[PDB]
Design a binder for this molecule. Structure first.
Ligand SMILES: *[C@@H]1O[C@H](CO)[C@@H](O[C@@H]2O[C@H](CO)[C@@H](O[C@@H]3O[C@H](CO)[C@@H](O)[C@H](O[C@H]4O[C@H](CO)[C@@H](O)[C@H](O)[C@@H]4O)[C@@H]3O)[C@H](O)[C@H]2NC(C)=O)[C@H](O)[C@H]1NC(C)=O
Ligand SMILES: *[C@@H]1O[C@H](CO)[C@@H](O[C@@H]2O[C@H](CO)[C@@H](O[C@@H]3O[C@H](CO)[C@@H](O)[C@H](O[C@H]4O[C@H](CO)[C@@H](O)[C@H](O)[C@@H]4O)[C@@H]3O)[C@H](O)[C@H]2NC(C)=O)[C@H](O)[C@H]1NC(C)=O
Ligand SMILES: *[C@@H]1O[C@H](CO)[C@@H](O[C@@H]2O[C@H](CO)[C@@H](O)[C@H](O)[C@H]2NC(C)=O)[C@H](O)[C@H]1NC(C)=O
Ligand SMILES: *[C@@H]1O[C@H](CO)[C@@H](O[C@@H]2O[C@H](CO)[C@@H](O)[C@H](O)[C@H]2NC(C)=O)[C@H](O)[C@H]1NC(C)=O
Ligand SMILES: *[C@@H]1O[C@H](CO)[C@@H](O[C@@H]2O[C@H](CO)[C@@H](O)[C@H](O)[C@H]2NC(C)=O)[C@H](O)[C@H]1NC(C)=O
Ligand SMILES: *[C@@H]1O[C@H](CO)[C@@H](O[C@@H]2O[C@H](CO)[C@@H](O)[C@H](O)[C@H]2NC(C)=O)[C@H](O)[C@H]1NC(C)=O
Ligand SMILES: *[C@@H]1O[C@H](CO)[C@@H](O[C@@H]2O[C@H](CO)[C@@H](O)[C@H](O)[C@H]2NC(C)=O)[C@H](O)[C@H]1NC(C)=O
Ligand SMILES: *[C@@H]1O[C@H](CO)[C@@H](O[C@@H]2O[C@H](CO)[C@@H](O)[C@H](O)[C@H]2NC(C)=O)[C@H](O)[C@H]1NC(C)=O
Ligand SMILES: *[C@@H]1O[C@H](CO)[C@@H](O[C@@H]2O[C@H](CO)[C@@H](O)[C@H](O)[C@H]2NC(C)=O)[C@H](O)[C@H]1NC(C)=O
Ligand code: NAG
Ligand code: NAG
Ligand code: NAG
Ligand code: NAG
Ligand code: NAG
Ligand code: NAG
Ligand code: NAG
Ligand code: NAG
Ligand code: NAG
Ligand code: NAG
Ligand code: NAG
Ligand code: NAG
Ligand code: NAG
Ligand code: NAG
Ligand code: NAG
Ligand code: NAG
Ligand code: NAG
Ligand code: NAG
Ligand code: NAG
Ligand code: NAG
Ligand code: NAG
Ligand code: NAG
Ligand code: NAG
Ligand code: NAG
Lengths: 122, 112, 436, 436, 122, 122
């Protein structure tokens, strides 16, 4: 079920991640409307994929990064977050740090790629 | 489609003091729980509704609480008040959206 | 520490463009819809609650806009009747006509254009009183819209049958639905499930009564934006249908008049048999029980010993004071006072509603685009399910309610109240113990 | 050795489709534009020079096309006036009319159609001399366009106010802008910055003088494709505005005539008070100083002791010999000879320009689509900033310049001269010391 | 700044590569025009991504390949190219070898993938 | 040649895979038709790329998986399939197992990514 994991805890829900991923691409009245909708759906898909590319998480549903958790974002324990909370609740808890985390992920990836080139040039 | 699990199936006490009965829903029922007392020979009597409200046919001796999918019943003092089988009933079926679909767990026999 | 997860099952309220689907010459071009899923799925969301608000639901707005635009596109290729704005010389129809129907039909004659520019023809036809006005205060008359709008004849081959459509979300979106059988339109909804497409909804147009919608499953439901505010409507949904039988008991003929190359006008010809008044029958016992149920529920908002009275509509145009509907292709305007005439105190037969008929229709309460409904030969009979009412408060121990009309939007929010559109936001992050 | 880099900051000249943005019933449908950025960014490019050419700038062509297409779409729903192509029986207006205005207005009467096809009505209205021609060489007249084009009445609710729009590049593109305060339209531009959107540009239409554009920041600028070629225009941009005050000092009435169902024509009714000539005032001292600045700069291309003379326009249609503009909704054709009457030798008051008014307009110098401008009641007064001139060379020690008209394109290339569109090409390669 | 690195040398500019990457996706007059523009912007994006895929550089801003520099393309020194030249100048210097390099990169990647399969089959 | 390998055997044809890959992206009558066609071509491209992403084969023309061949799908020998048969013939031979194999590939990838996170968390 497409949103079937909505009531699951975070540590339970993140095992069925492909279910949602597979459903993101799926001149008269009801004519021009479909053409416009199709184009916008494509743009949304690509923006999310570009971010995974930039952060170094392309091709993965789950990726580890090398960016530290800064605590002030959320000072909850891992056993509390993963076992006693759902993704809807979590999304609300840290919604205002979204842009902070994304900026940190982008810079980290740029530093990593530059360092890999220095090693391949050695 | 709501399944209620009630435990222990058998609870006992010395005369005087408290016992508890637990009940776990397979899905949150948003507190739509009722507790009943059935003595041998009659239909069940309603003691508590909407998780913690008494029917006034019962004294403060019977108390309870809970939320979501998990609830408990506490009998504060057992004076051989009963030898009733207590039952956990769901009064709301979230898979339908109604109050017309009930479910009962097995009961608990209280001995004292 | 930061782990990025993709495919996270979360969403936000959103407004997007929905498309229609249809389970397969119609005025709403339902053939232009995407074929439906023969076996659509529905997913129950365990432990998920959501907040709904039917009064702010933009799905209503899209349905409203699609209906009007489709309606207008369907008239684009149809013949214009501007050559009819002539002085009509006209008298009454008096042949075997029932009293109280007398004066409703008129026999008018005029000089119409024809196939050749050099010729004129004398023709005559019958008109209903409501479609003409007297100018020479036989007497001279003109069609009622000749000083305000263009008149377009509806194409005779186009159907007005309210064939249902389904609304479907685009990729990246989902439609949430309430299952709570007592949901009153706003606030938390304890049981939610998801669909890709809505149930089929019939684009039925009516005023005071809702003629062919859904019934409440259990209890009679009363929904309103406020209840307290006398400026707001109350939508009452019945939990049982009330059967209504309508008829136009006049066997009519139809003839075409050529008005120019490739063009013809359809005129009412003559009447076969006696001339009788159009009417609708509502079962009396059912109506009485149905109101009793509505009153018991209305009292919950007004007081245990509050008296509830029903009264008929206020004065004004037929379009807002009568019960109107399109059935069999004819446009009826029925007098509903026989249904709203009672006082409810704390602690076989039928009701006959006389009706009027019009051929010149301002369909969406707009000015400048008039449609002419060509006549239909033979006799028309219709049977439908009344499913609900639109009531207003006439506003200290007695409350009075009157039926009334409303926006077209109120006839659609009554079906769409259970649906919400959300967008899916698959990226999110959380702390974990891993590092690259 | 080969390393591939993505996101390389390079670009190439390119031609793409630009879209408009607007900072928010208008003839240009500016509400259809994308809302603008309240705080747009501009990036300075350090150490970057670029080559610009305002005479080959395709942004001008898109602006030209959008304006014409929007203009035409705005008239699509408006009433046609083809029933007015009748013989008009007509005489002169002689009531309290100022000499030299006498003969400009005529009182014409005719048999017009009405709401019913069977009736005709006698109506009369006032027309300007420039909109009619005599046929019976009272005298019979016809409207000037009845033998060549259809006449459409502009909708009275539609505004012609030149509300500015911004052009914005699509993703993958950028707009480069010159900052060089002395840039003359071509060649290297030492200081370049990037924007996503242009400054707002007003779609002002004029001929000999440019009435509401941008001013030069420092020096008066003279720009031309060639200067040397007498077939080319010279665009002169002022570094200070010249104030011009225009008026139509006649208090007019307006009346509507129903011409058919849903349709009406707006006619000039009568004149309240005396009849006077329309005119524009230009401050004299400012004009004199402004020309002196232009002459000092023109001499740089013609010689230190070359004499510069200004003369008025050549003969031809008003559309190309006069200064025309749309202000307050009226179309003025003003005589500019009082502004171009001097010889410049090496080493309070006002100028009054009389004006003519027309109601039938061939807006884009096209043939077949005529617009009728309905009259405006009351009195019209306009104030504007003259920002520049369009001059041509009348082509051995004296040069003579004349004002003239030109393509509509020349009124837009004067604002867009600083902008260039380029596309971004993010892939590139270079040798490095690494290997997989 | 989107083109802020335009005046930087190549070895300085290629540190801010994500700045440009993030800006590549970003029936009436001004109606149909936007729909057409959106579609073309998407096509351009995808063609560049497909080439990075084909050459084995997907998901990277900087990737090393195993294709040799042939010298005749540009016989400049690395210390000259990376430190005393901008990307605009470089793009002009080797613009006519673009198609040569791309063809070489494509063949190399096909050979590499075939060889990896032979090893995984061992 | 775009379909030049159509007559080649499977083991011969799968060396020129980029030839086809490079050709997948390439209001009046003949106006609106092109806009509609372009959008649909993009959607087709993306659906295939999404599947390679889900199965863990993104960025590759040839990828090995860890899913066993179940024999009943086709009990032919490898020397028969790769040397004496073309891709058109093969596509017909196992056309009805397409959905089985894809489901197996998707589950395998989800299990692999979860296990990698457990190791990176160690
Ligand atoms: C509420 O729902 C009911 C039930 O669905 C609905 O009643 C139906 O109305 C339609 C139209 O009035 C009826 O269909 C007609 O039945 C007669 C029977 O002989 C046929 O002759 C008609 O066919 C002719 O007219 C068509 C018009 O487009 C032509 O296309 C055709 O070629 C023929 O000329 C037509 O089939 C239908 O029978 C009833 N249903 C029942 C059970 O009576 C009712 O109208 C709905 N109410 C409202 C207000 O919409
Ligand atoms: C050069 O720029 C100047 C300054 O922006 C510009 O002058 C402005 O012209 C407009 C239109 O002529 C003036 O706006 C009018 O002001 C009068 C004042 O009482 C109002 O009554 C008018 O409103 C009526 O007409 C409207 C027409 O669409 C209707 O929509 C409205 O409902 C009313 O009927 C209207 O506001 C404006 O005041 C002047 N500005 C100044 C400072 O005087 C000038 O026209 C530009 N030049 C050119 C050639 O474009
Ligand atoms: C809704 O919530 C209930 C509990 O609040 C979840 O029930 C759990 O189901 C799993 C299934 O194996 C059990 O192992 C857990 O022990 C149950 N919880 C408890 C407290 O016993 C239920 O799964 C939730 N629904 C969803 C979709 O996650
Ligand atoms: C078009 O003609 C109709 C009929 O004469 C006008 O409607 C009448 O308007 C008067 C105004 O006081 C009312 O008293 C009448 O009752 C109206 N008649 C009807 C049948 O409603 C109508 O106003 C005219 N339209 C225009 C634009 O003048
Ligand atoms: C609707 O029908 C009712 C009755 O069938 C009409 O009511 C009559 O209206 C006249 C108006 O003065 C009264 O004198 C009668 O006493 C009323 N009769 C009853 C039984 O109340 C009503 O007028 C009709 N409405 C319309 C618009 O025609
Ligand atoms: C439409 O009528 C006008 C008015 O008679 C014609 O314009 C005249 O053409 C003659 C030709 O030598 C000129 O001398 C007149 O000066 C013109 N009059 C005006 C007011 O400019 C016009 O040519 C006719 N159009 C067509 C297509 O015949
Ligand atoms: C524009 O205005 C000027 C003067 O205000 C008009 O010039 C006059 O033209 C007649 C034509 O033969 C001459 O005899 C006069 O001597 C001119 N006066 C001056 C002061 O030069 C000019 O004709 C007007 N233009 C138009 C098209 O009417
Ligand atoms: C434009 O060019 C100047 C020099 O030609 C660049 O200046 C350099 O700035 C860096 C900043 O730390 C210094 O370390 C260098 O020493 C400067 N160059 C010299 C020769 O001293 C300037 O940065 C360039 N602009 C851009 C965008 O790169
Ligand atoms: C068409 O089929 C023929 C044989 O049936 C193929 O011929 C082979 O060509 C290769 C080329 O080096 C030879 O090594 C083989 O020995 C040939 N086969 C035989 C049986 O000798 C031919 O290549 C096929 N065409 C294509 C496109 O593959
Ligand atoms: C026609 O109707 C009018 C309505 O008042 C009536 O006065 C007149 O007598 C009627 N004529 C006939 C012939 O019935
Ligand atoms: C209308 O008048 C004509 C005149 O002869 C007559 O034949 C026709 O029957 C009349 N129609 C009605 C319905 O009275
Ligand atoms: C048709 O025109 C003639 C012209 O005199 C007129 O007498 C006649 O009454 C008109 N007929 C009708 C029916 O209007
Ligand atoms: C609908 O039910 C909710 C339940 O709390 C209530 O708050 C709301 O006021 C009700 N709606 C109306 C119009 O009373
Ligand atoms: C309408 O609803 C609002 C909701 O807050 C309420 O404040 C207002 O008083 C209501 N209207 C009336 C007349 O009560
Ligand atoms: C309504 O009831 C009356 C009662 O006599 C009956 O004659 C009439 O035919 C009925 N109308 C319908 C539509 O059945
Ligand atoms: C409508 O017609 C049906 C036909 O069987 C009849 O049974 C029913 O009672 C009628 N309804 C009314 C309101 O007369
Ligand atoms: C319903 O029937 C009862 C029967 O006595 C009657 O008293 C009551 O007034 C009726 N109600 C209506 C609305 O007709
Ligand atoms: C409602 O009934 C009263 C009864 O006298 C009547 O006067 C009034 O006009 C009726 N309303 C309508 C719209 O018929
Ligand atoms: C309303 O009820 C009264 C009660 O006597 C009755 O006389 C009147 O006719 C009824 N009105 C209608 C419209 O039936
Ligand atoms: C109307 O009259 C005609 C005359 O022959 C007849 O054939 C037709 O069936 C009648 N229609 C009805 C509904 O009775
Ligand atoms: C009226 O409701 C009944 C309920 O079962 C249904 O069977 C019947 O088809 C409905 N009629 C209409 C016109 O929907
Ligand atoms: C009308 O204008 C013409 C133009 O020459 C003139 O000859 C004629 O006398 C004028 N008529 C009047 C009444 O002024
Ligand atoms: C036009 O002629 C009519 C005829 O009576 C007159 O009333 C009107 O004032 C005249 N208009 C002008 C502006 O002379
Ligand atoms: C209108 O037509 C009549 C027909 O004789 C003619 O005499 C009259 O002059 C015309 N009126 C006008 C103003 O053209
Ligand atoms: C503009 O300035 C450049 C600077 O070299 C010059 O070459 C060019 O000719 C000037 N334009 C004109 C029209 O003279
Ligand atoms: C126009 O500019 C070109 C530029 O090369 C020049 O050759 C030509 O001579 C110029 N025209 C004149 C008349 O000088
Ligand atoms: C132009 O100047 C004259 C000088 O007397 C003045 O009368 C007139 O009103 C002025 N016009 C404007 C538009 O101010
Ligand atoms: C235009 O009107 C303003 C009003 O204050 C006046 O100051 C200015 O001098 C006028 N301009 C001209 C050219 O008369
Ligand atoms: C400007 O004013 C001076 C004052 O003497 C005068 O000589 C000169 O001719 C004037 N120039 C113009 C263009 O009026
Ligand atoms: C320019 O001025 C001269 C002065 O005699 C005049 O003859 C000529 O017609 C004027 N040009 C225009 C277009 O008025
Ligand atoms: C041009 O200057 C001469 C100088 O005497 C003057 O007589 C003439 O009227 C002026 N022309 C205009 C249009 O003012
Ligand atoms: C035009 O005359 C009318 C007559 O009352 C007056 O109200 C109006 O203000 C006048 N307009 C102007 C601009 O003076
Ligand atoms: C004319 O230029 C001045 C310069 O500051 C400006 O303030 C004024 O608004 C401008 N007028 C118009 C109509 O643009």
């Amino acid at each position: 079920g497409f949103l079937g994991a909505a009531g699951s805890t975070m540590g339970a829900a993140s095992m069925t991640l492909t279910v949602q991923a597979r459903n993101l691409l799926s001149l008269t009245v009801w004519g021009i409307k479909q053409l416009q909708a199709r184009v916008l759906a494509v743009e949304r898909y690509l923006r999310d994929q570009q971010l995974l590319g930039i952060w170094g998480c392309s091709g993965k549903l789950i990726c580890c990064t090398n960016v530290p958790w800064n605590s002030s974002w959320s000072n909850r324990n891992l056993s509390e977050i993963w076992d006693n909370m759902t993704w809807l609740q979590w999304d609300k808890e840290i919604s205002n740090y979204t842009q902070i985390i994304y900026g940190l992920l982008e810079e980290s990836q740029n530093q990593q790629e530059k360092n890999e080139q220095d090693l391949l040039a050695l | 489609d709501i399944v209620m699990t009630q435990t222990p199936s058998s609870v006992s006490a010395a005369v005087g003091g408290t016992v508890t009965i637990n009940c776990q829903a397979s899905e949150s029922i948003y507190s739509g729980l009722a507790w009943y007392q059935q003595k041998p020979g009659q239909p069940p009597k309603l003691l508590i509704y909407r998780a913690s409200t008494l029917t006034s046919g019962v004294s403060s001796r019977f108390k309870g609480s809970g939320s979501g999918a998990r609830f408990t019943l506490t009998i504060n003092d057992l004076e051989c008040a009963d030898a009733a089988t207590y039952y956990c009933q769901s009064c709301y079926d979230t898979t339908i959206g109604t109050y017309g679909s009930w479910a009962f767990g097995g009961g608990t026999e209280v001995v004292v | 520490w930061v782990t990025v997860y993709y495919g996270v099952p979360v969403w936000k309220d959103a407004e997007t463009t929905l498309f229609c689907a249809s389970d397969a010459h119609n005025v709403w071009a339902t053939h232009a819809c995407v074929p439906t899923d023969p076996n659509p799925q529905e997913i129950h969301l365990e432990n998920v609650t959501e907040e709904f608000n039917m009064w702010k639901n933009n799905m209503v707005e899209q349905m409203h806009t699609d209906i009007i635009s489709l309606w207008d596109q369907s008239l684009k290729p149809c013949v214009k009747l501007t050559p009819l704005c002539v002085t009509l010389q006209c008298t009454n129809v008096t042949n075997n006509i029932t009293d109280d129907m007398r004066g409703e039909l008129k026999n008018c004659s005029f000089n119409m254009t024809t196939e050749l520019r050099d010729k004129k023809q004398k023709v005559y036809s019958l008109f209903y009183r409501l479609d003409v006005v007297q100018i020479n205060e036989n007497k001279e008359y003109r069609l009622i819209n000749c000083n305000t709008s263009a008149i377009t004849q509806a194409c005779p081959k186009v159907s007005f049958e309210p064939i249902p459509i389904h609304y479907c979300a685009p990729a990246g979106f989902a439609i949430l639905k309430c299952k709570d059988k007592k949901f009153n339109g706003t606030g938390p909804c304890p049981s939610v499930s998801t669909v890709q497409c809505t149930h089929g909804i019939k684009p039925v147009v009516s005023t005071q009564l809702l003629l062919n919608g859904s019934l409440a499953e259990e209890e009679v439901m009363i929904r309103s934006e406020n209840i307290t505010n006398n400026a707001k409507n109350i939508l009452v949904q019945f939990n049982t249908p009330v059967q209504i039988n309508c008829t136009r008991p006049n066997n009519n003929t139809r003839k075409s008049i050529r008005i120019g190359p490739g063009q013809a006008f359809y005129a009412t010809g003559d009447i076969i048999g006696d001339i009788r008044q159009a009417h609708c029958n509502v079962s009396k016992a059912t109506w009485n029980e149905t109101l009793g149920k509505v009153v018991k529920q209305l009292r919950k908002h007004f007081g245990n010993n509050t008296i509830i009275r029903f009264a008929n509509s206020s004065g004004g145009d037929l379009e807002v004071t009568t019960h109107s509907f399109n059935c069999g292709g004819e446009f009826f305007y029925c007098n509903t006072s026989g249904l709203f005439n009672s006082t409810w105190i704390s602690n076989n037969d039928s009701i006959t509603l006389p009706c009027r008929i019009k051929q010149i229709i301002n369909m969406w309460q707009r000015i400048g685009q008039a449609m002419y409904a060509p006549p239909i030969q033979g006799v028309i009979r219709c049977v439908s399910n009344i499913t609900g009412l639109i009531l207003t408060r006439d506003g200290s121990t007695t409350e009075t309610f009157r039926p009334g009309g409303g926006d077209m939007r109120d006839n659609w929010r009554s079906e769409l109240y259970k649906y919400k559109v959300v967008k899916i936001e698959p990226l999110g992050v959380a702390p974990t113990r891993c590092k690259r």
